[PDB]
Structure 1
Amino acid sequence: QEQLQQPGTELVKPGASVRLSCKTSGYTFASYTLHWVKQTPGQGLDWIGAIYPGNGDTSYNQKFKDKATLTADKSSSTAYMQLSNLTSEDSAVYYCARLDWYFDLWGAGTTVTVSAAGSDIVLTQSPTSLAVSLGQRATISCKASQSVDYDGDSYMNWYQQKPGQPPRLLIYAASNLESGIPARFSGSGSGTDFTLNIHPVEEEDAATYYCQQNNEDPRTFGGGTKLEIKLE
């Protein structure tokens, strides 16, 4: 089975550097781009950059160009991201993943806790949290600052992250259910406006949902919507 394995936690000091690892298995490491993603409560997910492990070629989001360095070690099938000059602003969970929807695969993420006691497309989700009773409908909006469409296809996906589990693809290209996702989920929209629907909601559906566009670089994500069950 294909896996990306990341250590759970790194507790680190301001000003230090930390090297995060992503040990891959179950597929040819050299042949698939790997991406790294930062998660925070307020900013949702941020695309850091990506590496093609076969040759080591990298691309970085301008905002992380000095903070992150991506490398790949083909002899151990492991990708690494160094974060340098740590500050409190680096405390976050960092995932490695294959982000193209057809190869969707996520590691469980490494929590990096920096501890000292002392024209990109913007995606806006609405609401950012909601509680819905069992059996009822959850509806969540994602709006982009510019169109994410090309040739009649929307380059926008939705991701779900259930509590304690890695993120996973839920809907790709606006309206397609990923394999294995239940029929109670549905997605609509085009251009700049998209909507996720879940009905009837079940307990398993409690999760954080994120939209993402990959029409233009850098790939960007919404800030996340946390759905809970409203106990009745």
Structure 2
Amino acid sequence: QEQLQQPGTELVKPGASVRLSCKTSGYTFASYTLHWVKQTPGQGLDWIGAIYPGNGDTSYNQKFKDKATLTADKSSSTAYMQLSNLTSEDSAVYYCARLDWYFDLWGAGTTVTVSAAGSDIVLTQSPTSLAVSLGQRATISCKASQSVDYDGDSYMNWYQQKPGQPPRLLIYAASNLESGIPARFSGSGSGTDFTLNIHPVEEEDAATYYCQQNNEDPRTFGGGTKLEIKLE
């Protein structure tokens, strides 16, 4: 099967550099763009940049242009991201992924822990945490600072990350369930306003949910909503 394999942890000093690896298998490495994404508790997910492995071409979010360097090694089907001049603000989890919905694939992420004891579109999620009883409804809003529609399609997806598991696509283009996603999930919305609904909620639905837009560069994500089960 198709896999993106990333090391679990890197424990690193301020001021050093670290190289993160993403070993791919199961498909032709050279033919699909790979993207790197930073996750933190307060800021949700941040798109770092992308590489086309076939030729090594790269694109970077302006905010990461000095911090990250993406490379690819066709001989080992492995992509790498170097993070330079590490600071405490680099502590985070970093994922490699195929982000276009039709090819959705995520690595499990590398935690980078920097340790020393001593006009982008903004997406706002509401609420940012909620507890819902088994059998009841969860409803989560995502609102964009500008329209994410083109030609009557909404270039917005929802992602789910269950505890201990990689993120995965949940709904694409506002209202379409990804293959294998249960019927109790539904998405609505257009323009700047989108809503995820889950009913009836089951235990397996405890997760962090993120919206994402890909109408304009850079791709951006909401800060995440953590759904837990309200024990009765």
The interval holding the TM-score normalised by the smaller chain is over 0.9
2:78 maps to which residue? Answer: 78
2:157 maps to which residue? Answer: 157
1:68 maps to which residue? Answer: 68
- Cα RMSD after superposing both structures: 0.1
Any idea what SS the aligned residue of 1:51 has?
Answer: strand
Any idea what SS the aligned residue of 1:204 has?
Answer: helix
1:67 & 1:201 partners in 2: Cα distance?
41
State the 1:47 CA deviation.
0.0
State the 1:192 CA deviation.
0.1
State the 1:154 CA deviation.
0.1
State the 1:49 CA deviation.
0.1
Any idea what SS the aligned residue of 1:112 has?
Answer: strand
2:118 & 2:48 partners in 1: Cα distance?
29
State the 1:135 CA deviation.
0.1
Deviation by residue 1:63-83 (Cα, 9 ceiling, x = unmatched)? 000000000000000000000
Consecutive unaligned residues in structure 2, runs of 5 or more: none
State the 1:202 CA deviation.
0.1
1:92 & 1:98 partners in 2: Cα distance?
20
State the 1:91 CA deviation.
0.1
| Superposition TM-score, scaled by structure 1 size | 1.00
Aligned length: 232
| Superposition TM-score, scaled by structure 2 size | 1.00
Deviation by residue 1:23-69 (Cα, 9 ceiling, x = unmatched)? 00000000000000000000000000000000000000000000000
State the 1:93 CA deviation.
0.0
2:118 & 2:80 partners in 1: Cα distance?
30
Q: How many percent identity over aligned positions?
A: 100
State the 1:92 CA deviation.
0.1
2:96 & 2:208 partners in 1: Cα distance?
18
1:40 & 1:194 partners in 2: Cα distance?
23
State the 1:227 CA deviation.
0.1
1:75 & 1:204 partners in 2: Cα distance?
39
State the 1:15 CA deviation.
0.1
Deviation by residue 1:112-170 (Cα, 9 ceiling, x = unmatched)? 00000000000000000000000000000000000000000000000000000000000
State the 1:225 CA deviation.
0.1
Any idea what SS the aligned residue of 2:39 has?
Answer: strand
